[PDB]
């Protein structure tokens, strides 16, 4: 009947905490120096240990998750670390005089301009092809002298040609004393109590696929397709969608471009586009209309579960923002594509003929809302073609005072973090507090 | 019977108290200026810092070598009124830590003062002869 406190060291007790995670990737061997894997990420253990926690029920919140905020700052910081040593194209802001590529009734333009040479006193005139988006006319009156789009706002640096932009699986690990809780509930929505929970030291192979509008190469939701949002009632917050069946999308750049290596200084090398060899075709992606119409129908079924079992569900193209947010932007073999998705979100729902999408390309880009530094993607030699998985989406309501009679859904890409949340919805970081004090009928011996 | 790290987190406190070794093991174990290197090194220093703090508390409570140690501090009923069967056969360490997280700091202070600071002086005066 006399109770005394006793210290237990190693009690399964944890508390919500945010710590500094680190990198971990398999032992992939090779060209290399891919930005994300870096020179050294801790190689994944030959065998990971996933330990299911019986009887455990933990509250999750993918929208207040700090793993997202950390990953975001890691991608940004990794990008800058790879641009620092590469060649900066400060002298490439010389006035450009551009002409058309002949044809009657032009996305790319043939530009001639003078560029410095190895020797300070000598100069050289070189001709290189450019895309319309990367250039603006220096007159508007108009004459026809053009300049690079970035020279007015921020400097520019050329991405090194060796580093590759292909995402590889990356595992986010937590330090000793902390742990990661994975929600294995198939039907798990955005937030809430997860009945089935397990613990792991590192996450699964998460590929840092930077996309917009459409989610590519992600992980497929099990069982039914999932509709995740922070506030379905609030139109302002985006809507994450995860497919149970992946749709296939083929993007190609049929032009047989060429790489022109023009030295612009001692050691500095600039890689310009070389006249195209062969026909002049524009890049485009294909999607099977049967699968997409089927996949889009499965989405509207889960959509009605939150907007009434019967309601008008239409789809329109992006009507807000410009440039990145209006086009399904992404990377493919080193070239940055920008596709018009009006053909995919152009339906209305109530109660082998593959779709084609126009894609334009740029070589000067400012990703992640970066203000101050632009990057020049060196031209990729040969024909480019990449087959990717479209696993998720990012939608948004139009809002307004419509009496709930009809609901409209448009794509968007407001923030880059939503891409990370599409793969970090199931994980959570907690710290282990192994000191527990409890009363027992034991007493220390006075001896 | 081993379930793995934190396997008994949903079990009763009595069942979890049997596998404290499991949590004890996995509790500690040209330019290197990469973003990963700075994160890793800072993560490693954070892990040993937390481990040494808990081992520090066990040291000042005279319980360094053991996972289960008994003390001289009596259980003040204001902390919890639950009987032994209700505590050890009806509650998990999680919901227990939540019920007593309020008085943990007070309990830790009594745990370092009441015994091991009194015990060591009395141990010298006892083995003094």
């Amino acid at each position: 009947e006399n109770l005394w406190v006793t210290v237990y060291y190693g009690v399964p007790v944890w508390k919500d905490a945010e710590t500094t995670l680190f990198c971990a990737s398999d032992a992939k061997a090779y060209k290399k120096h891919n930005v994300w894997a870096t020179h050294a990420c801790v190689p994944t253990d030959p065998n990971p240990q996933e330990i299911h926690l019986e009887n455990v029920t933990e509250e999750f919140n993918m929208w207040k998750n700090n793993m997202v905020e950390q990953m975001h700052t890691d991608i940004i910081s990794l990008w800058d670390q790879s641009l620092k040593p590469c060649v900066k194209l400060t002298p490439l802001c010389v006035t450009l005089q551009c002409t058309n590529v002949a044809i009657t009734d032009g996305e790319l333009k043939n530009c001639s301009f003078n560029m410095t040479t190895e020797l300070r006193d000598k100069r050289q005139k070189v001709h290189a092809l450019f895309y319309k988006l990367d250039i603006v006319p220096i007159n508007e009156n108009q004459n026809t002298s053009y300049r690079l789009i970035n020279c007015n706002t921020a400097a520019i640096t050329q991405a090194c040609p060796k580093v590759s932009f292909e995402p590889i699986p990356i595992h986010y690990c937590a330090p000793a004393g902390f742990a990661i809780l994975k929600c294995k509930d198939k039907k798990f929505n955005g937030t809430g109590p997860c009945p089935s929970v397990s613990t792991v030291q590192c996450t699964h192979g998460i590929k840092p696929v930077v996309s917009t509008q459409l989610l590519l190469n992600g992980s497929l939701a099990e069982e039914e397709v999932m509709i995740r949002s922070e506030d379905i009632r609030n139109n302002a917050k985006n809507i994450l969608v995860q497919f149970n069946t992946p749709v296939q999308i083929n993007c190609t750049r049929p032009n047989n471009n060429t790489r022109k290596s023009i030295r612009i200084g001692p050691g500095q090398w600039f890689y310009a586009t070389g006249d195209i060899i062969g026909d002049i075709r524009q890049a485009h992606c294909n999607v099977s209309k049967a699968t997409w119409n089927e996949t889009l129908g499965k989405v509207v079924k889960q959509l009605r579960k939150h907007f009434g079992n019967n309601t008008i569900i239409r789809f329109a193209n992006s009507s807000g923002g410009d440039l990145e947010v209006t086009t399904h932007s992404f990377n493919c073999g080193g070239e940055f594509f920008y596709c018009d998705t009006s053909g995919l979100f152009n339906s209305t729902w109530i109660s082998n003929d593959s779709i084609t999408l126009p894609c334009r390309i740029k070589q000067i880009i400012n990703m992640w809302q970066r203000i101050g530094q632009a990057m020049y993607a060196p031209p990729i030699q040969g024909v480019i073609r990449c087959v990717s998985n479209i696993t998720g989406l990012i939608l948004t309501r139009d809002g307004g005072s419509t009496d709930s009679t009809t609901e409209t859904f448009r794509p968007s890409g407001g923030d880059m973090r939503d891409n990370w949340r599409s793969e970090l919805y199931k994980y959570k970081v907690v710290k282990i507090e192994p000191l527990g004090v409890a009363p027992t009928r034991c007493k220390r011996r006075v001896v | 019977v081993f379930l793995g790290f934190l396997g008994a987190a949903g079990s009763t406190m009595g069942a979890a108290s049997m596998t404290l070794t499991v949590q004890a093991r996995n509790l500690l174990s040209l330019l290197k200026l990469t973003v990963w290197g700075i994160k890793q090194l800072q993560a490693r220093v954070l892990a040993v810092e937390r481990y040494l703090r808990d081992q520090q508390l066990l040291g000042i409570w005279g319980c360094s070598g053991k996972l289960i140690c008994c003390t001289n501090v009596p259980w003040n009923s204001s902390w919890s009124n639950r009987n032994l069967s209700e505590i050890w056969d009806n509650m998990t360490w999680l919901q227990w830590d939540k019920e007593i997280s309020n008085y943990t700091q007070i309990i830790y202070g009594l745990l370092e003062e009441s015994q091991n600071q009194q015990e060591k002086n009395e141990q010298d005066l006892l083995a003094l002869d």
């Epitope: 009887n55 | 009595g14 209700e86 056969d89 009806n90």
Partner: nanobody
């Protein structure tokens, strides 16, 4: 600190079957046995059986082993430590002496020498068997 709410009273003719429900809240439904006990004027209080929401193991008294079917639904989580659930008992071949009051009851402890012991009881369901 949870409440068990049973279905309303029912009148059934002898020979028919009836299914009583017992909805729970305020605690982890998965962690405690659900017992079923009845009280009639002829036999007094009589324990019928219990069932485990976690494993599904059931133990029926021999007097009801051939006429009682106990089932449970899966818990709907509310918080990390509480959830809502539902248990059912289907009794068939009703007789006049089966008229009485039926109770569902939550077990006492998750572990020990008396885990299933009915501790938290519902408000009771009145069953009348008559032609």
């Amino acid at each position: 600190e949870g409440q068990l709410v049973q279905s309303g009273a029912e009148l059934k003719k002898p020979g028919a079957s009836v299914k009583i429900s017992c909805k729970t809240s305020g605690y982890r439904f998965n962690f405690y046995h659900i017992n079923w006990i009845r009280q009639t004027a002829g036999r007094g209080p009589e324990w019928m059986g219990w069932i485990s929401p976690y494993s599904g193991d059931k133990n029926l008294a021999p007097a009801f082993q051939d006429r009682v079917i106990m089932t449970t639904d899966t818990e709907v989580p509310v918080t990390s430590f509480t959830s809502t659930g539902a248990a059912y008992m289907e009794i068939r071949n009703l007789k006049f002496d089966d008229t009485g009051t039926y109770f569902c009851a939550k077990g006492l402890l998750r572990d020990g020498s008396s885990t299933w012991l009915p501790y938290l009881w519902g408000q009771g369901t009145l069953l009348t068997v008559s032609s």
